[PDB]
Design a protein around this nucleic acid. Structure first.
Lengths: 200, 141, 129, 82, 83
RNA sequence: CUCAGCACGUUAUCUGACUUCUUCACGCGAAAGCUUUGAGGUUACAGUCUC
RNA sequence: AACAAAGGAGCAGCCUCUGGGCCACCGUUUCGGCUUUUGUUGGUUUUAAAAGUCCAUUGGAGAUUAUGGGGCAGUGUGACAAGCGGCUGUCGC
RNA sequence: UGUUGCUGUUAAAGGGUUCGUAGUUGAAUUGAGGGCCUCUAAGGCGCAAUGGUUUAGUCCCAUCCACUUCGGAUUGGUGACCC
């Protein structure tokens, strides 16, 4: 046993991955003798797993999975967690996804009515985005549609928040793609309300 | 189009395009909830609860800073009214017209208005006994 | 109010086309309106289109290349069949050569030409030249 | 060239919030200072009712329907819409 | 291009002209559908000879949409400069 | 000050009403005429309801 | 597309290893019903599984933070006006 | 007699107005997935390389100085961009 593997799921404690051990330790280190409100809050927080994804970009991405149960907690302190973990684990982005589940149409009227619409495919995907974009918030989306029937999602983001996530865009896009099987593009706009795209 | 009589207006209230809470609101769900229920004990309807909240505390929407809106809060704490807002208001206006008409039987306007308000209340009634929110024996009078 | 979504869309397109305008706005959006546009964009009658998100109901926007002449709507969604493809194709269209009626089926949304091919009739949807 | 899909800046300055591409809000918040002490309190541009704090019987806003008329002598800082 | 037979042989008297602006068929009947031919120019102000052509429809001089469309056509081909 | 951190006017914008071009655009109509305020978008004939 | 239901606190099963305790089971009207094996039919009765119920912790989840929220108590921090102080409306104890 | 396919400002024909039941008609959401190999299959508002004396350019520079509407100057210049 270990007191740093208590940040992993109980099932995965006798059989952790190479990936999962490094982060596990890092969390436990953070939990002691540090800036406040993440010396205590991680103890209530137990991760399902995590994985490591490698693109052909400069940096890699460590993606984390923890239940939807702890989302409400982790959402607050999300920023400081990501950052302080990337310091301990340099050369790779940290992101925090909370695991959800999706449902399919049963091909019946009266059944479909009674399914959750937060369980549903779309709302899930949207929140996966918002998580990996954080800090920074989505403003507006477009779907553009081409001659092949190819539909392409675009997202647009604040020029206020631009600096932070500008570098992170290819990384985010990659992860989102390989998981939910949907392409994404990220633009910016200066005056989001009136919705004019710019390089500002 | 206006339901009864002439009218086209576009006076309305929009939404925010940001459904996540502001950076200047650091208040938690619980504080919001508490505020609602507190105010409600004065006999305030949800319509004025939202107004008090937005103006004083800078709240974007109740729904944005809590997982639920104003009636759902009240219901869950057993403070909710059993007569919906829209129905109650009309009945008040109605009775007040009937006072004025009791005195003035030469008044043409307020007579016709009362006819409107009546049938409008009936439409509401009928609605809320299909979609249960009133007893199924409810009637205006 | 509007009792057919299609009718609201394709009276903006037709009018705009008769004025030669190279883009049109469309007030609502539906899953259905998408599919209709998609067809015509393959066969070459539309450049592109965007769907924009207000997070209430979307606003479609379309680029006309001026290659259309009409886009109609058959409102009651009358039942057409494997023999009765012939009937419709004659009566509402100026030709059998380049007339395209679009139909609904269990399979999806498709041209009459493809409908015959897969041997399923259905209820009619709209038409274009 | 002009586009419907991506509109021009000057055009959408003009438009009503119900006539807009996005149909966003046309309001914002403000920090009104209570001059009877120092108490920073959030207030809403179209308050449409009085708002008080216990540091002011000077009030903060007038109820008026066009947009709030804030009491004279009060510090105004402009919060963003977003 | 144009109607063919099953033998691939053209049957048409002529194939009508295109109005570039609306991509509509210019009729023989329309006599307000003018063919504007501008002569291109190179460095040292020498004319290359007439090369480019526009064609305007007769439905664009019934409300004078003509000017508008000519600009969008021109500007795209780099003939008219915008800043 | 005193029905007053007010009232009017000008520039510009917007939503809601009534109508004019005696330079109303397209189009429609037998013509007179009608024009975002339709009798227009209809033989390329089908938004909805009713008399 | 239509029919019907829902109308949202007018609600809502966490799963699971093993061990113990109690306990008829239908049913309750003056005695009725009842699961195999013991060679078989007729009679009673026992042990045993099952089910229920009580306690126990074995492993695992959870779609919303129980080392948590809500409310009391002790100490220091910041602070208003009278009582006190600067040495010029306002500052602090 | 106009369901397919009628008309009602002036020609036969919109009810004086409003409320309102039968009846007829009624907005949007749940979402129809992907990868590796071959193919000159296309596009490219991606891009390392390396090509191009004006065998193709514009900004900078050189020389003039021309009060102000001349220019040329070469290796110009990882510049710009073009096959």
């Amino acid at each position: 046993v270990k007191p740093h593997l208590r940040k992993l799921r109980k099932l995965k404690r006798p059989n952790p991955s190479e990936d999962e051990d490094s982060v596990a330790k890092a969390l436990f280190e953070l939990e002691a003798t540090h800036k406040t409100l993440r010396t205590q809050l991680p103890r209530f927080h137990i991760n399902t797993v995590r994985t490591l994804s490698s693109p052909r970009f400069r940096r890699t991405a460590t993606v984390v999975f923890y239940p939807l149960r702890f989302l409400m907690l982790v959402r607050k302190i999300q920023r400081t967690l990501t950052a302080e973990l990337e310091k301990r684990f340099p050369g790779s982005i940290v992101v925090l996804v909370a695991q959800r589940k999706i449902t399919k149409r049963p091909k019946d009227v009266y059944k479909l009515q009674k399914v959750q619409r937060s369980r549903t495919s779309v709302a899930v995907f949207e929140n996966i985005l918002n998580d990996l974009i954080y800090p920074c918030d989505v403003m507006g989306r477009r779907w553009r549609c081409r001659t092949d029937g190819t539909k392409v999602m675009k997202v647009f983001l604040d020029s206020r928040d631009r600096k932070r996530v500008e570098s992170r865009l290819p990384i985010i896009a990659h992860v989102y793609k390989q998981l939910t099987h949907r392409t994404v593009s990220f633009g910016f706009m200066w005056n989001p309300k009136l919705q004019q795209v710019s390089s500002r | 189009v206006r339901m009864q009589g002439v009218g086209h207006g576009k006076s309305a209230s929009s939404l925010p395009f940001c459904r996540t809470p502001p950076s200047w609101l650091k208040i938690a769900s619980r504080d919001v909830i508490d505020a609602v229920c507190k105010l409600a004990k004065k006999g305030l309807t949800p319509s004025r609860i939202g107004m008090q909240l937005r103006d004083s505390m800078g709240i974007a929407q109740v729904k944005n800073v809590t997982g639920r809106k104003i009636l759902r809060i009240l219901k869950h704490k057993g403070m909710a009214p059993e007569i919906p807002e829209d129905l109650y208001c009309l009945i008040k206006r109605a009775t007040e017209m009937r006072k004025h008409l009791e005195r003035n039987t030469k008044d043409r306007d307020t007579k016709f208005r009362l006819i409107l308000v009546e049938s409008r209340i009936h439409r509401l009634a009928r609605y809320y006994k299909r979609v249960k929110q009133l007893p199924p024996t409810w009637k205006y009078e | 109010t509007m009792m057919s979504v299609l009718a609201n869309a394709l009276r903006c397109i037709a009018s705009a086309e008769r004025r030669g305008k190279r883009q049109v706005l469309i007030r609502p959006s539906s899953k259905v309106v998408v599919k209709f546009l998609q067809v015509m964009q393959k066969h070459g009658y539309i450049g592109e289109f965007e769907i924009i998100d207000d997070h209430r109901a979307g606003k479609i926007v379309v680029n006309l290349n001026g290659r259309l002449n009409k886009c109609g709507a058959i409102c009651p969604r009358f039942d057409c069949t494997t023999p009765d493809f012939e009937k419709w194709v004659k009566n509402i269209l100026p030709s059998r050569q380049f007339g395209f009626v679009v139909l609904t089926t269990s399979l999806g949304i498709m041209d009459h030409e493809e409908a015959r091919a897969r041997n399923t009739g259905g209820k009619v949807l709209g038409f274009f030249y | 060239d002009s586009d419907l899909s991506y509109p021009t800046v000057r055009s959408e300055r003009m438009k009503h919030k119900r006539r807009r591409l996005v149909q966003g809000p046309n309001s914002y918040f403000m920090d009104v200072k209570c001059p009877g002490c120092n108490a920073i309190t959030i207030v809403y541009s179209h308050a449409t009712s009085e708002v008080q704090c216990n540091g002011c019987a000077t009030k903060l806003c007038r109820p008026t329907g066009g947009k709030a008329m804030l009491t004279t002598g009060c510090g105004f800082r402009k919060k963003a819409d977003h | 291009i144009g109607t063919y037979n099953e033998e691939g042989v053209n049957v048409d008297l002529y194939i009508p002209r295109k109005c570039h602006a609306t991509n509509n068929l210019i009729t023989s009947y329309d006599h307000s559908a003018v063919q504007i031919a501008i002569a291109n120019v190179d460095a040292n102000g020498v004319l290359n000879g007439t090369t480019t052509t526009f064609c305007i429809a007769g439905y664009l001089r019934r409300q004078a949409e003509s000017d508008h469309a000519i600009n969008h056509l021109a500007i795209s081909k780099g003939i008219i400069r915008i800043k």
